[PDB]
Amino acid sequence: FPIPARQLFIDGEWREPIKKNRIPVINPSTEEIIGDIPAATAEDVEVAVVAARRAFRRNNWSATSGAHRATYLRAIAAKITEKKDHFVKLETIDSGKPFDEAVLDIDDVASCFEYFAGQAEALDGKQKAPVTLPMERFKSHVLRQPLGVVGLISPWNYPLLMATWKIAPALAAGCTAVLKPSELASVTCLEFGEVCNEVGLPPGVLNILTGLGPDAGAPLVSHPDVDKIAFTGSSATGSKVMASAAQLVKPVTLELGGKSPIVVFEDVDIDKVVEWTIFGCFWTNGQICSATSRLLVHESIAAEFVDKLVKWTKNIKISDPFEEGCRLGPVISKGQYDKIMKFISTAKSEGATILYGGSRPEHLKKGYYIEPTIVTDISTSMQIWKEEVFGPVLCVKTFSSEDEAIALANDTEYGLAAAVFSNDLERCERITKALEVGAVWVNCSQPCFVQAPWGGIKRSGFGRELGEWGIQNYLNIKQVTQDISDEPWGWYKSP
Amino acid sequence: PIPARQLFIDGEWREPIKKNRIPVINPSTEEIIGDIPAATAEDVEVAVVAARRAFRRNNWSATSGAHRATYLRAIAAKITEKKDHFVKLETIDSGKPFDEAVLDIDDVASCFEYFAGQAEALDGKQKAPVTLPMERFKSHVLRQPLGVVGLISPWNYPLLMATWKIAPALAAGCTAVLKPSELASVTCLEFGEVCNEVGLPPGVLNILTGLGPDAGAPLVSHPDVDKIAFTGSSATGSKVMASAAQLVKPVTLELGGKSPIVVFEDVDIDKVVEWTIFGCFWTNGQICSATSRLLVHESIAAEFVDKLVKWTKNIKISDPFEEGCRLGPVISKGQYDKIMKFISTAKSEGATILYGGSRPEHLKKGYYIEPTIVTDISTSMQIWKEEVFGPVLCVKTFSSEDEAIALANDTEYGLAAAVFSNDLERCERITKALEVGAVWVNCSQPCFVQAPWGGIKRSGFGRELGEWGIQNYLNIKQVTQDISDEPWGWYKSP
Numbered sequence: 001f002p003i004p005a006r007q008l009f010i011d012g013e014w015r016e017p018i019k020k021n022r023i024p025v026i027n028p029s030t031e032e033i034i035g036d037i038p039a040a041t042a043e044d045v046e047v048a049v050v051a052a053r054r055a056f057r058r059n060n061w062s063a064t065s066g067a068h069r070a071t072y073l074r075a076i077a078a079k080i081t082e083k084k085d086h087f088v089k090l091e092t093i094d095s096g097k098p099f100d101e102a103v104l105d106i107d108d109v110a111s112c113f114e115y116f117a118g119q120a121e122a123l124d125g126k127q128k129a130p131v132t133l134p135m136e137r138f139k140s141h142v143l144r145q146p147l148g149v150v151g152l153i154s155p156w157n158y159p160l161l162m163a164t165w166k167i168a169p170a171l172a173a174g175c176t177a178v179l180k181p182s183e184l185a186s187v188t189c190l191e192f193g194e195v196c197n198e199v200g201l202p203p204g205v206l207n208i209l210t211g212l213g214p215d216a217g218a219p220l221v222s223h224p225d226v227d228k229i230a231f232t233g234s235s236a237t238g239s240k241v242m243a244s245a246a247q248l249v250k251p252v253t254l255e256l257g258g259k260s261p262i263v264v265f266e267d268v269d270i271d272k273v274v275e276w277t278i279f280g281c282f283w284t285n286g287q288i289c290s291a292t293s294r295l296l297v298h299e300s301i302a303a304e305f306v307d308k309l310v311k312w313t314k315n316i317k318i319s320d321p322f323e324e325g326c327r328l329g330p331v332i333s334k335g336q337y338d339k340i341m342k343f344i345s346t347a348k349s350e351g352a353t354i355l356y357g358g359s360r361p362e363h364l365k366k367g368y369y370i371e372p373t374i375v376t377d378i379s380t381s382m383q384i385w386k387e388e389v390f391g392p393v394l395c396v397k398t399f400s401s402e403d404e405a406i407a408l409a410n411d412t413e414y415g416l417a418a419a420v421f422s423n424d425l426e427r428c429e430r431i432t433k434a435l436e437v438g439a440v441w442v443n444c445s446q447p448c449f450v451q452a453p454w455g456g457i458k459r460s461g462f463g464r465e466l467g468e469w470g471i472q473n474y475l476n477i478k479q480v481t482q483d484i485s486d487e488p489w490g491w492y493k494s495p
Numbered sequence: 496p497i498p499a500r501q502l503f504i505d506g507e508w509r510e511p512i513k514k515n516r517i518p519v520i521n522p523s524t525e526e527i528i529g530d531i532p533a534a535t536a537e538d539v540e541v542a543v544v545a546a547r548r549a550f551r552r553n554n555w556s557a558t559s560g561a562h563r564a565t566y567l568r569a570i571a572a573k574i575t576e577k578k579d580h581f582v583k584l585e586t587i588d589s590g591k592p593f594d595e596a597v598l599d600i601d602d603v604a605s606c607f608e609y610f611a612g613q614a615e616a617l618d619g620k621q622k623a624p625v626t627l628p629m630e631r632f633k634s635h636v637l638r639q640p641l642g643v644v645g646l647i648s649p650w651n652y653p654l655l656m657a658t659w660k661i662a663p664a665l666a667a668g669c670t671a672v673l674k675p676s677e678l679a680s681v682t683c684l685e686f687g688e689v690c691n692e693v694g695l696p697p698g699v700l701n702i703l704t705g706l707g708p709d710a711g712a713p714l715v716s717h718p719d720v721d722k723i724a725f726t727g728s729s730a731t732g733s734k735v736m737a738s739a740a741q742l743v744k745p746v747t748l749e750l751g752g753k754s755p756i757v758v759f760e761d762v763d764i765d766k767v768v769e770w771t772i773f774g775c776f777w778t779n780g781q782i783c784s785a786t787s788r789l790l791v792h793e794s795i796a797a798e799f800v801d802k803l804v805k806w807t808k809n810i811k812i813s814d815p816f817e818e819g820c821r822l823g824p825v826i827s828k829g830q831y832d833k834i835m836k837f838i839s840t841a842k843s844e845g846a847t848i849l850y851g852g853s854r855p856e857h858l859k860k861g862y863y864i865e866p867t868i869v870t871d872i873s874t875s876m877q878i879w880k881e882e883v884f885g886p887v888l889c890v891k892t893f894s895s896e897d898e899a900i901a902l903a904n905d906t907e908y909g910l911a912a913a914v915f916s917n918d919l920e921r922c923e924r925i926t927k928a929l930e931v932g933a934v935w936v937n938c939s940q941p942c943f944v945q946a947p948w949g950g951i952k953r954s955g956f957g958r959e960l961g962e963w964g965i966q967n968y969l970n971i972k973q974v975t976q977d978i979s980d981e982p983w984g985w986y987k988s989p
């Protein structure tokens with residue numbers, strides 16, 4: 001099977017970049033160029049937002065009902081499901097994640113559009129929600145209107161699914177949007193532009209611009225007619241996005257990954273837990289914004305736990321993502337490959353011992369492949385304990401008391417997620433409340449349902465996506481307050 | 496007889512570390528009537544460390560909303576009991592008519608009582624179940640306080656604007672550093688003693704007065720402050736957000752505007768004219784959501800503006816304590832100048848001061864200005880675009896409904912708007928089309944704590960008050976639990 005060659009998706013049609021640049025698509029499994037994607041610039045950003053503004057002003061989208069827009073979202077979920085095999089293949093070759101992971105992403109893409117079709121519908125009965133006032137002179141209610149034209153910026157670790165997390169609620173709210181996917185993985189998002197045509201989404205409601213960060217993303221963020229930005233990616237970049245938005249006091253949401261702890265107490269089924277620790281740091285080839293990449297395990301069961309950890313870890317088949325049984329593919333790019341190696345490198349140079357992994361798999365000579373890696377004998381002053389590695393790399397420290405666990409778990413500038421393992425469910429509740437985190441998993445790690453709110457605190461960003469919080473990111477909450485008295489205010493004296 | 500206070504930090508009156516102070520001026524007499532402490536970065540540092548420790552103790556942040564509500568109601572009761580005191584200190588510090596001040600102070604009691612209620616509602620939302628489509632998992636939502644928050648409030652409603660931020664943050668279980676404006680800091684400092692009188696735990700609320708750059712900017716940039724709530728000018732708002740961005744800390748912004756009041760032909764002119772006066776001249780014109788641009792129909796224009804000036808004419812411009820005062824001095828001479836500059840610049844660009852434009856005839860000193868009405872406007876004029884923040888109104892005609900809509904939305908701002916018309920269908924159509932955060936229908940300016948407040952566009956973002964107020968200060972925490980005790984079954988068992 002080959003790969004699609006697309007132009008930019010603007011105003012319902014396929015448009016060459018104005019400066020005509022393209023950049024390559026590399027298969028992370030082979031390090032070879034397998035195609036290329038259009039590379040948008042500020043000039044293309046300008047025509048996409050003009051088209052999005054034009055579409056927002058038309059009589060067929062933004063002032064329509066939630067139920068109406070829901071028919072489009074359900075059509076998308078259907079289409080995505082209909083073209084299921086096409087999207088998982090592309091996602092697998094583009095992102096490098098195992099085929100099996102890929103199929104669950106495309107399943108989750110359709111589920112997300114379904115869920116928000118529902119949220120669009122439920123939005124209709126929330127309109128003109130009454131606000132009881134103290135004074136019978138006045139009455140009040142709330143309108144939930146679409147905010148306007150929005151910029152959506154989505155990362156490459158779940159390419160289509162991270163885009164949908166932003167596309168779905170924004171379209172449910174009645175906004176029109178410009179999507180900027182990551183240059184490292186843009187193939188399925190571009191294909192999404194066809195789905196839009198095929199379901200008859202009005203032109204300009206969604207526009208998809210691929211390209212480099214400074215060229216396609218930055219102009220979107222700084223554009224004077226974009227009302228809001230939703231960003232997911234690195235904390236470093238998120239700071240730059242917000243600095244830029246601040247010039248026009250433009251609102252943002254940010255989900256900036258983290259350094260999430262997984263806290264394991266003495267009283268557990270060690271074989272079920274070790275699999276969750278593996279899933280929480282090595283699944284998605286370790287490229288998980290909510291990676292439980294700090295293991296804190298009670299020294300009581302430490303040795304045994306670490307033992308069976310390496311045991312399960314060694315049994316992880318590392319291979320090309322299309323081959324049956326693959327549980328770990330290559331990391332996304334050479335830049336990322338180098339960065340992870342430098343993290344491992346610097347780790348031992350600060351005197352930490354690479355218990356397992358830490359290098360290419362000898363049996364794979366090409367591709368950005370890395371061994372699932374367990375780092376031990378860790379100080380809390382080491383770079384690898386502080387910083388997001390975004391590769392299959394796990395740090396490990398033991399703890400004495402519950403209070404030491406909590407303090408260790410919370411000793412980070414980040415605060416996206418955390419997981420806590422213990423059969424003592426009273427203890428689980430105590431730890432859950434104490435964690436300085438936006439998402440806590442109890443006796444599991446990493447399942448993210450569209451039904452529940454998602455985001456972080458501290459340097460992991462702010463705002464909640466998904467669930468009943470998703471739509472609200474895209475709304476103008478309009479207060480409307482009417483004087484029904486028909487009588488002089490009576491404050492000023494009449495002449 | 497104005498109080499002399501130190502900084503309120505950790506439940507104690509603490510002297511600024513560099514022990515500087517700055518004047519307090521009665522806007523009516525231009526005389527230094529006292530002084531307030533001026534904090535520096537050092538003071539911020541110890542006040543934040545004080546809020547943080549207070550947040551870690553076990554008598555505030557992890558307690559119930561209901562527990563914290565008892566303090567909220569106690570505060571509201573104490574303010575009510577000390578009403579006369581606060582009303583007078585506000586009237587002399589801020590410069591709004593005594594009558595405006597009593598309403599303000601009533602409103603801060605009511606605001607603390609409302610959010611006591613919302614704190615109690617908050618307990619009822621803890622562990623709200625979220626239905627999952629997998630039997631293996633259950634989920635719920637916890638609503639926990641964010642942490643230490645920086646609250647920055649402006650001088651046009653000194654205690655009220657501060658209250659609007661203190662009340663939800665404390666309701667949420669946060670601890671707070673408050674930095675009021677240097678131009679009206681006395682009731683806010685005085686609020687400190689109220690906190691001790693009710694037994695508010697030390698460090699839960701901290702009150703640093705001072706200069707923006709010495710006191711505000713270091714709060715905004717402090718690495719242990721979790722969030723900033725800001726009301727003020729759009730220009731400063733850009734700056735606080737830019738600064739907060741350095742550490743990706745969240746922000747709410749309400750940034751004033753250039754709000755239109757649209758008046759159609761089917762209106763009782765005298766009622767509508769009075770509201771128009773209220774919309775632009777009340778609070779001495781220092782209204783963030785001032786409806787400062789009158790869009791009035793052709794067929795009823797010149798009539799409307801005559802009776803308009805005939806209302807503007809007998810507005811008593813007295814010292815704020817005198818009887819019947821319906822307009823007072825603006826806050827400072829700094830502000831006085833740039834409002835004057837705004838008016839001369841209007842004449843130069845070829846506008847006509849249909850009334851006012853100068854110093855009141857009968858009041859020789861004080862930063863007083865007559866209620867000003869400006870016609871003969873082109874939309875390219877400075878006075879049409881920019882926020883004056885003074886008792887100055889622009890008027891323009893229109894004739895199409897689609898024309899009024901376009902003129903009303905022809906601003907980079909988007910805080911509020913007022914629309915007047917007996918036909919309520921037309922009211923509905925207009926309120927939907929206005930690119931704005933709040934629409935008043937057949938009135939202008941009533942703000943109830945019950946309803947969500949905030950703007951869009953250049954006027955900022957975020958909703959305060961109402962059932963939106965508390966959630967600005969919350970960590971919405973997802974908690975999803977595996978209740979299967981079965982293997983996940985992803986990888987292969989060794």
Ligand SMILES: *[C@H](O)C[N+](C)(C)C
Nearest residue numbers: 288289290446447448
């Ligand atoms: C839930 O698991 C969310 N991510 C983004 C990591 C898949």
Ligand SMILES: *[C@H](O)C[N+](C)(C)C
Nearest residue numbers: 782783784940941942
């Ligand atoms: C109500 O009018 C809102 N303000 C800020 C003016 C009090």
